[PDB]
Structure formats: C-alpha cells, structure tokens
Amino acid sequence: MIHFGND
Amino acid sequence: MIHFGND
Amino acid sequence: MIHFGND
Amino acid sequence: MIHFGND
Amino acid sequence: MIHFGND
Amino acid sequence: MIHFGND
Amino acid sequence: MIHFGND
Amino acid sequence: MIHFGND
Amino acid sequence: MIHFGND
Amino acid sequence: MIHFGND
Numbered sequence A, B, C, D, E, F, G, H, I, J: 001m002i003h004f005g006n007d
Helices: none
Strands: A002-004 B002-004 C002-004 D002-004 E002-004 F002-004 G002-004 H002-004 I002-004 J002-004
Touching: none
Parallel strands: A002 B002, A002 I002, B002 C002, C002 D002, E002 F002, E002 G002, G002 H002, H002 J002
Antiparallel strands: none
C-alpha cells in the first residue's frame, strides 16, 4: 500500500 | 492499494 | 484499488 | 476499483 | 479549484 | 471548479 | 487549490 | 495549495 | 507500505 | 503549501 495523506 | 488523501 | 480523495 | 472523489 | 485525479 | 477524473 | 493525484 | 501525490 | 503524512 | 509525496 501507498498512502499520500494523514491518518 | 493507493490512497491520495486523508483518512 | 485506487482512491483519489478523502475518506 | 477506482474512485475519484470523497467517501 | 479541487482536482481528484491525475494530470 | 471541481474535477473528478483525469486530465 | 487541492490536488489528490499525481502530476 | 495542498498536493497529495507525486510531481 | 509507504506513508507520506502524519499518523 | 503542503506536499505529501515525492518531487
């Protein structure tokens, strides 16, 4: 997985 | 998965 | 899956 | 699936 | 402007 | 403007 | 401006 | 501006 | 996994 | 500006 952004 | 954005 | 946007 | 937009 | 998607 | 989609 | 996605 | 994604 | 952003 | 991602 790749996440660009805040949790 | 790829997520561009906040959770 | 690919998501452009916020949850 | 591909989603352009917010949940 | 708001863009959900690639350029 | 709001764009849901690729350019 | 807000951009969710790659350039 | 806010950018979620690569240039 | 790769995360660009805060938890 | 805020950038989540690589240049």
